[PDB]
Amino acid sequence: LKHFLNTQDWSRAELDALLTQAALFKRNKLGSELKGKSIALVFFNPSMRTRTSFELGAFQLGGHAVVLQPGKDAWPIEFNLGTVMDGDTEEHIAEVARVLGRYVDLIGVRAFPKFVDWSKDREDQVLKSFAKYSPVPVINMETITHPCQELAHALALQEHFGTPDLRGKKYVLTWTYHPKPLNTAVANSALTIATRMGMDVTLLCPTPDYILDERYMDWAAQNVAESGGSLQVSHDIDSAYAGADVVYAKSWGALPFFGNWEPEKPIRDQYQHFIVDERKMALTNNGVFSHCLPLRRNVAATDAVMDSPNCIAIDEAENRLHVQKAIMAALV
Amino acid sequence: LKHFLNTQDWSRAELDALLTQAALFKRNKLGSELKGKSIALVFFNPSMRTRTSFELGAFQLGGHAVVLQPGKDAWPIEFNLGTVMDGDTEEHIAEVARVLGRYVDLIGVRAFPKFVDWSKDREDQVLKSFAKYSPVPVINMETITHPCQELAHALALQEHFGTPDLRGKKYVLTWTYHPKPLNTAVANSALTIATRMGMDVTLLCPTPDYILDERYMDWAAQNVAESGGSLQVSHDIDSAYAGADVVYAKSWGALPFFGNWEPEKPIRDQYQHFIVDERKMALTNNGVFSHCLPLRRNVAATDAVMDSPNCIAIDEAENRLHVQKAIMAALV
């Protein structure tokens, strides 16, 4: 059974086919690829674009999406095995996935880390549990990686440069400020797809404490070796932005501080100058800027950068709809 | 780009066309006016009829509605410009409206005042922000005015009297009791459409403190001069109801008490006799009674009045479905 858990699990040819089908759907939005079919969209965290784009995508392809929010409308779910369920959780994923598998044709799941222990969050227990117990394809709607974002992002870049071949472009994945410590998912994914695409990638962040999990630094290293791009870590803003073709920002909490955020607060707070502004974007080679959204203006990026013609964030957001339809069609 | 923010923005001919299309849809509910199209229904406050009627209306016309609740499922939204978003809001309406504009064909928004400062609430910031940043038509699902209610109400009256011409009827918009200070939206709209329809309107309320915002008293004055009706304010129950053809009740908080509700409580509490009962309705010319709903029985109106054959509230509620379909069809 094929699932869409990570682009890293798919061959380059398969990913190219997806992006091309995405472009095709963007030109002809209505179809019958999901006629009479359905997808269960399970959300354990907030969402506006993911929920909306999947729901509409199912509709446009003749199917129907059922939105569920365990703990809100649906019952809270247990993922640990062999435990005595006498706590808050009402039922086990074993039953949940099998039941939904008797109803829908696809299952999407969004589940951010709990931020108490990275050793546990990095295991990707929720997504893996769904893939294990579900008799139907599972789609990652963002857990510790965000593959749907990767493809929406990739497509937006290919459209902007007018070519599927991004090899040679200088890509800067930069950490940016946010009052709270957030998920590394988007950064992990950006690093993954940018290298898989063969670009010259620089991970820019305040300190070594903000370097991404080794798993992704390794995926990237492997992708570079296979695509022909390059990877490097930098803590210097001016040199990183220098001559960049693409700048993608996202804020995330330092991994070593999971379960202990009080001390990383004063740290991130002394780096709010990492905000993407006009000055930094001026150091780029007329590069484009993007963000996965939601974005806090004048914190993560200034109003000027957001409203600049070089910002393609709205296009990337739109592409979530198109690439996801390509994914659902491929899995059904 | 044309939006449906207020009936006051539309010409009488356009409004008549809407009401007529509403009557047409009421006779033939299924259509293809929205085939393959979608509408995002953004709710910042509770709703049963508005959510249900729009959702079903989209379905019956071949489209699909996506229901969003910022702060609940979707992310909380910032509307102020140039602010540093380091608070509760996650993203700006600038991005939200542009993103949704890449997904849906129409955007509906419901956002009641915050009740802390009428100077801010009366600016209609949320609705205006959506209309400004959205590349697609925006529909007011109730902010400080409730135009969809206006048309459902108007249609119900025309059906009841068997004619589109309501000129000459005595219309009584009366404040009624409620334990809490509420939105003036429905009253502002009733005053607006009743005068635009050319009826003899009397705004009945406990004290001068409950008179509606000047903006609407002026719209009404202008509508009367153009339609041939009349407008007057009254604090005397018996004389207001006398010979009335239509009685529309709604409770709202006194505008001068915004941000300071503790003192207006003992005030409204000494006027719970404004409740619409049989005695008052007996002073009318066999007039009809209606309310936008939700209605608290034996507080806003007695059981007898609600169950009287002269109450058309259920018909008005039904008409929300029909007039809204006419609105969506016109804007698409």
Added chain:
Amino acid sequence: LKHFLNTQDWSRAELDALLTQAALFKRNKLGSELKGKSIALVFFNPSMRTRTSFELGAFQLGGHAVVLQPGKDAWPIEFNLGTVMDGDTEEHIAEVARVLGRYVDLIGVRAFPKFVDWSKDREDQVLKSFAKYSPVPVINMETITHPCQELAHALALQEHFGTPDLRGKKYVLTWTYHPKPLNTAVANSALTIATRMGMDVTLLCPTPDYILDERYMDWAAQNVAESGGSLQVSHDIDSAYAGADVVYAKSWGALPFFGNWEPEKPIRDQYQHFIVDERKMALTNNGVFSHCLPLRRNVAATDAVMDSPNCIAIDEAENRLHVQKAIMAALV
């Protein structure tokens, strides 16, 4: 007007027709029985299967389901008559049911007891109020009985044994452990349908305090006399399971303790050995096990029993979809 409030209200022939149509729909899922029609699914409590199956069922039959959650999105509702609504509730069911009746073709409602007073909960006020004021058919999505579950359960048993005739099988409805006192609805319904099907039913529970409401013990007694089965109450595990053909477990709070749960806690806690495990299932005649779900593993039933090939809970859950489509089709 015909509603689906309880299987007890329907003749055996009608119930057989429903189950057969359910089997038919299971073979041919897509249809036009609800083309252009809609159903309002009103939930006053959590749900995953009921919400999902009804929503998808409406879709597969060409209709649309509108999901409402009073107090969450829709306004809170009052059910008592003649009361002065100056409390938490915003509107009365009288208006709610009549309004929805102008929008949808069917209304489903889920409302668990409040657990404060069984004298009030057993009156089934919410379901009865909807049936009284609604101009369209009402479907019980679980209140104090769960008829939709009954049919999904019955169908699953008929499929398992390969025959519609279950007369002669030993059916064991057993109470099982749960940290909290729950609704008796599922047990009341299991007792009702198992006897209506003519099986030899044994209600197994810790003490006389856990015997179901007389209303259902009487329905069962009447069903046995008409179907040819049998009914008996037992507080002895080993003898009850002995030679059983079917074992259905559910935990519920002792009725005499409504409004006073502190003391029934130490009681249920001394009976956690009622958990369905391999030992007990070994005493059965290679019997099947099922549960309505959600189920807490290693509390209500062990992992081994849940994963045993004799567990048909997933099949029963799937059947909720099929029997409900048969119900909606019959009522429309």
